[PDB]
Symmetry: C3
Subunit: 116 residues, 3 copies
């Protein structure tokens, strides 16, 4: 059995599927400049990739959430994140501070999920 | 087959199980203020979650260890970590610096393990 | 079924295998002092561990890439990384800034892959 890939470029594939597992690349925001908007955009991008890969939000296994400024933005992150999640079905998660590839990026989230 | 969850709140589940895999949320210390005590507390919390999820320390697959100050606390981390591990059965691991959600938190560890 | 380990010391195993999955410890450079050389060395070390564990570069599922200085070294990282990858077969990846265990280490990469 072989890995399959979704949205491949020279650096990464947006998703790699292997058996019943889905590995997503860290997703970054769209055009939003603020933390709330950026978190919404990251999570929307994750939701679409889960769909494309045969998974869904209820089948997320783990999320690592990277914040440029964890002290400043943790509460906003949690607000948007908890809304977006399916009720009673939150995944494992780890939230830490790390600078991302562009200084305007405030949040990036990496998800592993189960195929349905 | 569906993921199952242990200790779910609005943001996360302490553990998510899927087939033979166990994904733990990043664990943070208890009341300790010092690095040695905090590392002990994080590892004790991991040990209990592994038990609850049908795993054990000998079945850890990977650990990512986050230190607020890696230069300052790496040696203390390693001292406590190597004691806690089952002899000859260390997992894959990655240790990096990252600020955690509270400034008093010096160490946080995220584990993936195999069900028994 | 039990995890098996490659290159175990008191802190970590370079690789842990479990069923069809391979979990590698974060790999650090060899003797290089510059970002290009260091990235080459990290990736060479990963390639050997994949071989030892029954995998290969075409079966990488995820990579988390840690840069001491992401603003400064992202472009060099990408240059070496894209060369090293098998054409059209890039994995999922996440690239973030984090200080590593030694200040001279500029880059560290943690890989999960599929057994062949």
């Amino acid at each position: 059995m072989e890995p399959t890939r979704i949205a491949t470029n020279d650096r990464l594939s947006a998703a790699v599927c292997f058996d019943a597992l889905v590995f997503l690349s860290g997703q970054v925001p769209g055009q939003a400049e603020d933390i709330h908007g950026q978190t919404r955009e990251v999570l929307a991008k994750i939701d679409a990739l889960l769909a494309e890969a045969g998974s869904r939000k209820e089948r997320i296994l783990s999320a690592t959430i990277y914040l440029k400024d964890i002290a400043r933005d943790f509460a906003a992150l949690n607000e948007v994140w908890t809304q977006w999640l399916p009720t009673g079905q939150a995944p494992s998660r780890t939230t830490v501070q790390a600078e991302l590839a562009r200084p305007s990026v405030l949040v990036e989230i990496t998800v592993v999920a189960a195929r349905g």
